[PDB]
Write a protein that binds this ligand. Sequence first.
Ligand SMILES: *[C@@H]1O[C@H](CO)[C@@H](O[C@@H]2O[C@H](CO)[C@@H](O[C@@H]3O[C@H](CO)[C@@H](O)[C@H](O)[C@@H]3O)[C@H](O)[C@H]2NC(C)=O)[C@H](O)[C@H]1NC(C)=O
Ligand SMILES: *[C@@H]1O[C@H](CO)[C@@H](O[C@@H]2O[C@H](CO)[C@@H](O[C@@H]3O[C@H](CO)[C@@H](O)[C@H](O)[C@@H]3O)[C@H](O)[C@H]2NC(C)=O)[C@H](O)[C@H]1NC(C)=O
Ligand SMILES: *[C@@H]1O[C@H](CO)[C@@H](O[C@@H]2O[C@H](CO)[C@@H](O[C@@H]3O[C@H](CO)[C@@H](O)[C@H](O)[C@@H]3O)[C@H](O)[C@H]2NC(C)=O)[C@H](O)[C@H]1NC(C)=O
Ligand SMILES: *[C@@H]1O[C@H](CO)[C@@H](O[C@@H]2O[C@H](CO)[C@@H](O[C@@H]3O[C@H](CO)[C@@H](O)[C@H](O)[C@@H]3O)[C@H](O)[C@H]2NC(C)=O)[C@H](O)[C@H]1NC(C)=O
Ligand SMILES: *[C@@H]1O[C@H](CO)[C@@H](O[C@@H]2O[C@H](CO)[C@@H](O[C@@H]3O[C@H](CO)[C@@H](O)[C@H](O)[C@@H]3O)[C@H](O)[C@H]2NC(C)=O)[C@H](O)[C@H]1NC(C)=O
Lengths: 346, 346, 346, 346, 346
Amino acid sequence: PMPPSEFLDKLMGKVSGYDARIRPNFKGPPVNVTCNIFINSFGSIAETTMDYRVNIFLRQQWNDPRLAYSEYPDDSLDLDPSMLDSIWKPDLFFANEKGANFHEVTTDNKLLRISKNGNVLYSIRITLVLACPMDLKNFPMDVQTCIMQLESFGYTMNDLIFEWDEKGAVQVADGLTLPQFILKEEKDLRYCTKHYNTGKFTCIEARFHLERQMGYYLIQMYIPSLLIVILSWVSFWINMDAAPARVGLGITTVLTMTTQSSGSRASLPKVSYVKAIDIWMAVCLLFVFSALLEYAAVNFIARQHVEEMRKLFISRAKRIDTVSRVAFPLVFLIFNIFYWITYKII
Amino acid sequence: PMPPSEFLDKLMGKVSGYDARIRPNFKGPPVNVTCNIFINSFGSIAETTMDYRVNIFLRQQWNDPRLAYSEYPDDSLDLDPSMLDSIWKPDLFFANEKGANFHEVTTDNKLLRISKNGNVLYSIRITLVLACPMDLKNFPMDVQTCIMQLESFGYTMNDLIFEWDEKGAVQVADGLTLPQFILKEEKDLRYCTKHYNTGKFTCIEARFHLERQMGYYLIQMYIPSLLIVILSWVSFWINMDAAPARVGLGITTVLTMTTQSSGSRASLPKVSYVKAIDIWMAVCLLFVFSALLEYAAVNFIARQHVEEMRKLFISRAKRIDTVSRVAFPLVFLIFNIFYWITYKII
Amino acid sequence: PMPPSEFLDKLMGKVSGYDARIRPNFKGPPVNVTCNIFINSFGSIAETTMDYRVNIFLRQQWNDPRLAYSEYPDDSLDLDPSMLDSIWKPDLFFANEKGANFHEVTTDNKLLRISKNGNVLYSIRITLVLACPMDLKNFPMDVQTCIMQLESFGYTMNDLIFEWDEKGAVQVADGLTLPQFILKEEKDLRYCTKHYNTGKFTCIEARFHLERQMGYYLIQMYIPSLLIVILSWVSFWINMDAAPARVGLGITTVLTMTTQSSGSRASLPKVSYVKAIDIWMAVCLLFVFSALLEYAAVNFIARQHVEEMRKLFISRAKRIDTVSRVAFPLVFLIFNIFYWITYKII
Amino acid sequence: PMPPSEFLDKLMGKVSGYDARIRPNFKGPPVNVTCNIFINSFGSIAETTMDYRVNIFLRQQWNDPRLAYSEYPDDSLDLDPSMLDSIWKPDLFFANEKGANFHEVTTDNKLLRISKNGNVLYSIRITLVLACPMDLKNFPMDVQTCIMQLESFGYTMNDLIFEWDEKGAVQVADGLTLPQFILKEEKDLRYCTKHYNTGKFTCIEARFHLERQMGYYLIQMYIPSLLIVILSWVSFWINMDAAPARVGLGITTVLTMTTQSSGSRASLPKVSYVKAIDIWMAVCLLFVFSALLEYAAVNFIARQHVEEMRKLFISRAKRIDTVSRVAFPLVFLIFNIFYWITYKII
Amino acid sequence: PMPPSEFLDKLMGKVSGYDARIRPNFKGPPVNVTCNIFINSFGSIAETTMDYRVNIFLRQQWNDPRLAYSEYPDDSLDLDPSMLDSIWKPDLFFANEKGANFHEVTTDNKLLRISKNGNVLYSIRITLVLACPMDLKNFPMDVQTCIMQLESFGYTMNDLIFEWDEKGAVQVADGLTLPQFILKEEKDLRYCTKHYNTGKFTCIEARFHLERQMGYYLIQMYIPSLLIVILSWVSFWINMDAAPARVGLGITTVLTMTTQSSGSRASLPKVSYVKAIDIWMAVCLLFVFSALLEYAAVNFIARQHVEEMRKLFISRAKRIDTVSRVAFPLVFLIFNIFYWITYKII
Ligand SMILES: *[C@@H]1O[C@H](CO)[C@@H](O[C@@H]2O[C@H](CO)[C@@H](O[C@@H]3O[C@H](CO)[C@@H](O)[C@H](O)[C@@H]3O)[C@H](O)[C@H]2NC(C)=O)[C@H](O)[C@H]1NC(C)=O
Ligand SMILES: *[C@@H]1O[C@H](CO)[C@@H](O[C@@H]2O[C@H](CO)[C@@H](O[C@@H]3O[C@H](CO)[C@@H](O)[C@H](O)[C@@H]3O)[C@H](O)[C@H]2NC(C)=O)[C@H](O)[C@H]1NC(C)=O
Ligand SMILES: *[C@@H]1O[C@H](CO)[C@@H](O[C@@H]2O[C@H](CO)[C@@H](O[C@@H]3O[C@H](CO)[C@@H](O)[C@H](O)[C@@H]3O)[C@H](O)[C@H]2NC(C)=O)[C@H](O)[C@H]1NC(C)=O
Ligand SMILES: *[C@@H]1O[C@H](CO)[C@@H](O[C@@H]2O[C@H](CO)[C@@H](O[C@@H]3O[C@H](CO)[C@@H](O)[C@H](O)[C@@H]3O)[C@H](O)[C@H]2NC(C)=O)[C@H](O)[C@H]1NC(C)=O
Ligand SMILES: *[C@@H]1O[C@H](CO)[C@@H](O[C@@H]2O[C@H](CO)[C@@H](O[C@@H]3O[C@H](CO)[C@@H](O)[C@H](O)[C@@H]3O)[C@H](O)[C@H]2NC(C)=O)[C@H](O)[C@H]1NC(C)=O
């Protein structure tokens, strides 16, 4: 019962002629590689960049007859990771990496165990910054689907095939929550077989269904956008005398409404389509621009009105200042219903 | 008495058949690894990212019978760190690293000494950026508990076990203070034994109880939020004549109160729950929005009031402008008591 | 039928005297290297820096007679990438890299296959941050032409020549869209043969015609710039009595128009020439500065006007306040036509 | 007279049995290592992070009898830096590195020369980002003392000792100035002998006395803070009639004074103690808050004043508006004297 | 006619005893190294950091008799760059690197050719971030002189000397323009021979004369600073009645003039000396502060004026409001002439 590495000497070195430069079952059927990932860290979901950082354990399993062994008694030899640069390993890469890296802290974070019948279990900790093109049409109420797809790079489909094992292909750490999102529990697992001018390459991808939390965007942008609408209404309970007051009120509540429009996109890409948060800030910018025009009508109607005529327009001009107090606060409401219900069924 | 490395030649090389690729006490009980950390640098506690950077010395101790020696006279051979790539070392990693690194400046910052009975003392300087999910419910008065946990990655529980030595498992440099926090002196030391679809892996974690200093947030956000509330009150000692003054006063003190609401979260994650600093900026935004409505009542009540009737509402409208001077400054106070006492016992 | 690497032993090692340090067809005609790129990731088109990040697959093809083989039966031996540090490879570099890198995640992302007649197919995943000097004359309506050029660095033109293969020299991933641009489908392919004091070096470049999307810049800068122009007009339907109102209106709508001028260049280089977005913000800053002067004329003309004289200037001063309501809203329009048509045919 | 490296062959290789893995004078007295640094680049003194970047040449000198030589005629053999991975070198590290690095541009920036009697001169270019906890009590007038300390990491005090040579232990490049500071010329040199649970380790540190330049902070924060105080005074030469003017004046000069308070700390850590720049912005925020209350008294006193009574308070209310014009401008001055003299002797 | 590397075998390996660890002409005169650089990328001229990034080709030439060859027929053997780790190479470094790096994309970007008489031509692509202390006295009209200097680090002056070849020591790529600067065509080439406590080291530096483009700073800071001065003048064509208007006008045009003062230094170091852009923003801040005081005089002079007396000061107070309309607009102009002419001859 010699030590395992010396047993591994019989397994790896020039004895038996193991070559790590040639895939298993060479010249025969392709190599069936079953995969699955464990997720430690999920988050930093960027939107200026439209990517996100994950921290996974990538488990790979394939059979290699050359790694058979019956001398040793037990069923598994979880070796040292230094034995990992000498056996064959599939050239798995992430088709949307945007930068990734291993982890070498106190050891290469690597695992490797071999079953008697040649089954290999290979597992390494990885940090990825995967690209997912965000779809920001209905932005605060959107549901993103950021993917990650595992391709081969040098082996064609007839010489290396990936799969997902049918027992929980994607696990997640227990207490894993996101600050801005929630990660839905059903995770898709479909095929993405690529085709180039070089050949066809195996591919498999996992679809994570993110979904934004409404709390933050409800506190910083919607409510402050809404109070500024109400102050635009207090220009109606003021007489048609305070020219500086109402105009000063409206202008101050139309420029601050312009700042928050731009402020609602500081942390966003410069996309060219209008998004759900945009029509809110637009329509809220339309009401406030109306009250500054409503007083524009009053101050002009009253100034234009012999003595039986001037009061004749005071009633009309003052009729407006009472219609305004109900028109705006209710027209805004019915709009406020068609908006949220539009994004409660979309 | 040959030189130690040549003595180490007898200890390491092909003589005696030392293999660094196989753990001590192989096929027997697992390897008991006692740990403890020394902390040089603690800080850069991020909250947008919810991590923090530490600079530790990681000390590991385990027994290895193969490293026994009785030839040399003294009790310890603190070797060169180049002898560190040839002996066995536990594959300790940090389960929430988020990026780490060694230090190679003028030497690998590594220590290694071996006692006669085989005890190994292994110590290396590390920089870590550990992830700790912040809980920002009561934000300026919160108490975070950021952890660090030491797991194995390739050895299962029956073949490698970590522990904390029971003599000061976590030391700290003497004059170590944080700018924003204070690091409490009692540090937890519990177990975090993991379970995967691969097996069970040893784990141990240290719980550091951070606690925010109230000084900064008391100077930039609470007091400026409070002066703006008081200026909202000076719209009461002004007659019910200065329409531009009081409305200009209230509007200017309701928008600047909106900026500071958003300004109170520039360096924060976009969490979806309301936090303690939020109800302050909200309630302070409610008082100021009230004074702008209080004058909305006065200017409307006085404008609506034969000659025995107009003065009848001047008293009512002026009754308000005196009730306001005591109502707001005292209602705000009683709120100001239920707030701080709520976060002095929570 | 020995294994291929051992077949490759006959192909690479000291047998047959293959030297990777000497180009093919040595002392004869130069080495004809046909190229083409596949683009996975395109974007992060910076403008403060005037660069952009691409993620390509660089395919290279050249003949090497030394790599001939007739022993093996089939037509191609797609080897392991470890066989890539032993064969000759052209020293292709990117003449405007500004930083690049390979991808080592789970494998060097490399491909290598050899045809029987010696044809080499070499393909590697690369991330580039290529420099392209932006031309921002007509900025929101511009069309950039960012290049990428493949030069030799050590081999002169008579010893190594690059080319583009005449079957789709530049492919693109199917669903590849940009957030801010659209990538036109015709891609140029011309020569860029360099000359130094060392000699002449082969060079080939690809010209990508980017083109900005107008949606974002139409929403954040043009419309907000335009509403502020209209509020500058509401200072005309107000009587020549509200000195605080109209002046407060104009000043508030002339400073906020100054902020947006500077705000229209936060994410731009500090170029010294005037650009298309600049004349908009300038002319819009000229109208608003006019209305604040138009009231400057009214308040001065009315204040200067025995009793038959004061009304004589009221008509003139009030004649202005009606000419203004049509002059500005129509002069702005005709300008608004010469502007967009100027950038619809330029 | 064979070539020196072949002479060095007799000096380094298996001939003579030189081992680089064992310190000089082994088993005897410790190794006396005299040090000194030359500073090329000093600066980037961060305060959000409380560190700073230096670029030094670290010179080390120790004796090694094994490196004796009398064959060669001259006194010094400045070798190639490749000979630096074969001789012993002290494991000097920087106890507050916070990240450092060598320089490999066109060569490892390393020097190495050996005197006949065994004296070694070892010198390498380094970039450091050293941590120094700032003390920001009297911030714009402060004097920081950022240190750098050279410790051993694996050798205890009885086996390796550092020192500073007594001929200019710290030189500086000639034209080395800082943008924000000035580096005082006397530099401290004391001992910092550490103690751990492992043993006692040699340590030496250099104390650089930085001192801020007052020019910048005098131009951006003090003067603008002071003009805004004066405009708060121009609310006194205005009659007690312009309710919108004085209140608009005071409010506009009390909120802009709040912005600059927060603006005076954008580039600062979130420390919890009040600092010298804070009491300035506070007291300046107290004067401006007073003038807005001073008019609060006037408009209330005049509004409260049969016909012999109303003028009786006009004199009192107008008595205030003249006392204000001298009270504030002189009370501010005497404060302005106790402030600067307080930070001219502290 | 064996292959060149095998010819190079006779040139490099143990045959002939070539040692790369010993400089040419050893024990004799020093090694004369002629240099010159080609500049691809110039720019990213930082000012917060006072550095800049360049992308050069560094060509070095020296003679090495050991590399003589007469066997081969032609005049030059441009080898593979792998032959670059075996020949001697001067240890050139950049005395103000602040971080640099090679380029390894698809090959080490290296060139190496050897003439028959031993002349070596060595050329490598480099990216540098060189430090140049900016002199910002007359900031928008300044002319910086950022240097780059090539020193030895281990060889003293009597054993290695650098030079510039007298045929175009510094070339530049053809279409190389900067966004903010223009690179003057005459480039200095002088000596910078260093002296340390170790010895004297060869040094040579190149002086690039940068010069700012005035376009950007003329558009964002001077003109907006100037319009705000003119609006400060429109407080003069308004009667001495509009207390809220003129004071509101002046205050709004004195605070926005304070923001732009600070805004004129966001991207600048915190230098302690006053700079040319500072006196502009200061003097422009002095005019606007004057108009707010000019009305302070009017409203006080008119309010202080039996019936023959009140009109007596109306003329004096109104005499001011006409002197102002010519005093300020012309005093500002004459200042505006002494300013630009002062920076047209400095
Ligand atoms: C990797 O897995 C794939 C599919 O999971 C295997 O492909 C299939 O392999 C079988 C060999 O057992 C091939 O033989 C076929 O058998 C069926 C009866 O089961 C017979 O009716 C067919 O005529 C054929 O002979 C089968 O063609 C093949 N199918 C495909 C789509 O590839 C593959 O063999 C596995 N390879 C390894 C190395 O494990
Ligand atoms: C590492 O440490 C663990 C615990 O600190 C050791 O586990 C224990 O090891 C003993 C061997 O001395 C095992 O024997 C047990 O002894 C008790 C009497 O002390 C006896 O009553 C039991 O029936 C049993 O024979 C013990 O089972 C084991 N317990 C556990 C929970 O593991 C371990 O031996 C140490 N290994 C090394 C290599 O130091
Ligand atoms: C690489 O490709 C270039 C061009 O694609 C080849 O250049 C040409 O190579 C031919 C050899 O077949 C040279 O011979 C010429 O042939 C024509 C008839 O086709 C004859 O009229 C000429 O007098 C001459 O003999 C030709 O000069 C040469 N032209 C150029 C511009 O280089 C090159 O041979 C290819 N090299 C390899 C290694 O594939
Ligand atoms: C490194 O430097 C230290 C101090 O600079 C040296 O320590 C001293 O070394 C001397 C050996 O010459 C030791 O001997 C002492 O000599 C005095 C007379 O000078 C005698 O009165 C004492 O009784 C003792 O014998 C001395 O104890 C020792 N002192 C200390 C504090 O270490 C050291 O020898 C130097 N080592 C090397 C390798 O250069
Ligand atoms: C590297 O270049 C330097 C200068 O470019 C050379 O320095 C000079 O080298 C000459 C050898 O030819 C030395 O000899 C001198 O010759 C003059 C006549 O030309 C004679 O009048 C002097 O008395 C002396 O013998 C000369 O001293 C020396 N000068 C200096 C300042 O170094 C150097 O030789 C070159 N080295 C190599 C290896 O190319």
